[PDB]
Design a protein around this motif. Structure first.
Motif: not given
Lengths: 159, 159, 159, 159, 159, 159, 159, 159
Positions: H21-29
């Protein structure tokens, strides 16, 4: 004349493996009996066999079985005699199930476990021999000769 | 005079092997307890195993962890029965200890017990059952010990 | 002329695997000896071999064995020379017992372990070569050529 | 009158088996809970399993760890369905428990559940689903329990 | 006449294993159906099969599959009926993947798991029989005869 | 000038690799210690391995955990002997680390040591034994170190 | 015309397995290239291949290798493209070494791993297809047809 | 609108899946995060997977532990690429999770990542690399993220 070692196996399918224990005992001229006893298919046969082993003059019991191998452990549960276990190689898990089922006995009821397969069957017979040799001078000498021949016969270079 | 020898690879193995020591003492079986490293003191091991029989030992209980070669190499130098205790290892939880001890090829046996404390206690009990074969007094003490274990099991759990 | 690498194996059964180490050394023209030495069947032969290896001019020892494979570790216990171990594939556990018995050496006595089977035997010879190449310019060049040929010979597409 | 019997090798197994007990009570299934050691009280096990059917039991849930022979040996003495719960072991994390229970050869079944608490709870649920086959009232309670489980699953995690 | 046991398998490749369950049920004269249902290739076929099993009169479902074997678990997810799982031996991991995929069900949805392979298929049928015998006197007697014959037929010595 | 290079995948590996560093320093072997990620800095690894020989390095000790490709890829780019240390992983306890390092196919060797701290210490000792082959002074220090280890083993445990 | 998927394998020995990926891609009419690239024997070939993949128009890379299988991971280390890994079944460890070497990638450099062997090769191609289908309507329809045919073709009963 | 769906079997899986979850948000997905139990809410899973494509999802990341069927069953109902995250289990440390997810037979793929947090983070990164194939802006952000990871690796450990 009377058997001093009892070799029991879960089924005819274990014979290909346990025959190695039988051969070794015969080689060292150790009187023994070889039988099929199933922990799960013939539980009462096992109870009676293990319970009366000492009375019948047996000194060591070699038990082999595969898969969820309970034969050695349950045999040890009914006898005060030393029980040696041989993990028979199973089709799928190659004896890993056999091994863990036999060696992982909780404290209180031991089973001296040998290697998976033929090597284990042969070593169970040799271990039984080393036990009997403690109080049988003649056998002790034959075992010494057997071990000496094994050592002397190893080639120095491969063919 | 000691009739059983308990040997281990290091002081770290004592936490496990002390259970074998306590049980032998409980059954009044004279024994010695030593540290012998197969890797750090190979010649000490050779000499210990070689002379065990002449020194009066009847059974050797060897414990080691990881690449546990102590039991097997001890057995290579003595005609006496050798029992192996796989000491639990940090990473592999004794699986490396177990396989490196139990998987002896044909010709040099090591009666292997369970990983850890249960194995150490059972090594002592197995040794006792071997000695009981030619020691009536010990046979009686062992019978009493086994009978007590059976009679001491509760019928229901403390729910 | 005199061997600088010693290849020892537990038995004739290990030859099918260790022959790959022998072939590689011959290919790189590295003088060596190939022998059978059993850690458990010929413990004194091993002690003498390992103890005198350095004196005899050996620089590296390649040891292969299967099951409860103690050959590499015990060899390393007696020599200061680098010992490389080859886990021979066992029938039941496919070399997992061989691998753990060899690689899991405790701190103090190392054994550089290679892959289970033929690949491991070949790589033990190559690793021995890379060690000798550190102080043998001619061999170093031959090893460079061998590695260069390996790299250049890999096909670009499957057949 | 109990229709399900929950048996375990020792008090240490209760931490795990209590989950089977709680679930049966939750579904209002009369049952008994006992400690029966396959190794320490083999005759107690034989008698328990032998008489289970005549005593009115319909299903037996057996839990044990390590070399877990309790479920299998119980099944050997009863015609009733036996469910096995592998109790997590210290070193091998229940893998020895699992293999020693599930790997029964053909002829004597043991319906095995997951290692640990989940397995104990599921053994109770499986027993319930078996009893529900001929008990309409219980079938309804089980249906309600399953429906509630499904309806109680959240749609999103508490992020 | 109408099936009371449903045998479902992931594919034709599982038949070599599941045929043993089919044979046993026929032997005990237990009306059943034998079908191929893939959890991943025919998910809706599985949902419909499992959801309507009880309505159709089925009492027990025996499901077998290999690899990432989800058939038993997902079947149990849709039915209140007891589901027995047979881990089919996989090519690479020999059914260890099959076993863990089936037995490790979390609390709430059980699957009574049997041994990997043919033994497991045979035992799933026997376990299904022992379940049906609880409320079918005629079958109960036939199962008693089957178990009695198994026990009486075990040879006393190997050939 | 460094003759041994110690490389690791991350700072988290230092807890383990520091044992290799300490031992080399103890034996007075000049070396460098760096972090090189096979996955995050592949080109850094290529350059490091490629130039190692020309920079004067004789041996490379590489440590990594999980899918540990650092040792193998380093060996792919250098003709120097590469020793691998499997760093213990959280879930699989270093088994993934061990298999991903030791199982190199034929042609590119990695002398692998035990999982964890023992392996790191042994990688340093193995490197030392390799360097001692052409460094008399170091050979003497190593001989003294090995002799001291042997002489320092206690004869009995602190019971 | 130009390849959008690249299939790379460690050696010719992997072809028996990877050919299944090639066949599937051809079946779905997905332009691709099939090559042999060794992570350890041809490290620079791999670096160049992976580094330039995106520039050359590749969208997905399917990599297969066995043993200490570093091909997928190292390929992913140099490309931003999605890399799918196929664990090839190894002789001794049956692909368990291959699997752990590929799937256990640390955070930061992913490799979508498929099953060991032929199934994995086929699924890597299907997964690559499902990825390309996200932005290729024609292919998306062909994939739908392929999945629909798979589902509809499963037999209802075994032969 | 969400283009990636993250689903997990229970709240207990969130500790692991939050990394995806955190990574997708980080990449703005854009994405959604839900709890869907394959065993407790099978119909919820069927509906979720069936409608994913029409709802605009391009990739599904599924996490589960133990007998982890969520990823595989999700893939059975959607034509979209499904990535699986093996959540670490208590007893078997995620090995059951891993095998039950990665071993999908041919026809229904699940791109599997490492056990635990690393796998969850990598599932997000793999999903990102798939989306970057047809999203220039995201491709740039991913390139920047990968480049930063590489540039952020230290050259030496804090000794």
């Amino acid at each position: 004349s009377a058997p001093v070692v009892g070799i029991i196996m879960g089924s005819q399918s274990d014979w290909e493996t346990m025959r190695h224990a039988d051969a070794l005992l015969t080689e060292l001229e150790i009187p023994h009996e070889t039988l099929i006893v199933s922990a799960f298919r013939t539980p009462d046969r096992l109870a009676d066999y293990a319970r009366t082993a000492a009375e019948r003059g047996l000194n060591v019991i070699i038990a082999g079985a595969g898969g969820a191998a309970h034969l050695p452990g349950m045999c040890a549960a009914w006898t005060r005699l030393p029980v040696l276990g041989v993990p028979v190689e199973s089709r799928a898990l190659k004896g890993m199930d056999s091994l863990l089922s036999i060696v992982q006995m909780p404290g209180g009821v031991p089973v001296g476990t040998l290697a998976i397969g033929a090597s284990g069957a042969k070593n169970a017979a040799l271990l039984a021999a080393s036990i009997l040799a403690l109080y049988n001078p003649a056998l002790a000498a034959r075992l010494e000769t057997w071990r000496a021949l094994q050592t002397a016969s190893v080639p120095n270079s491969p063919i």
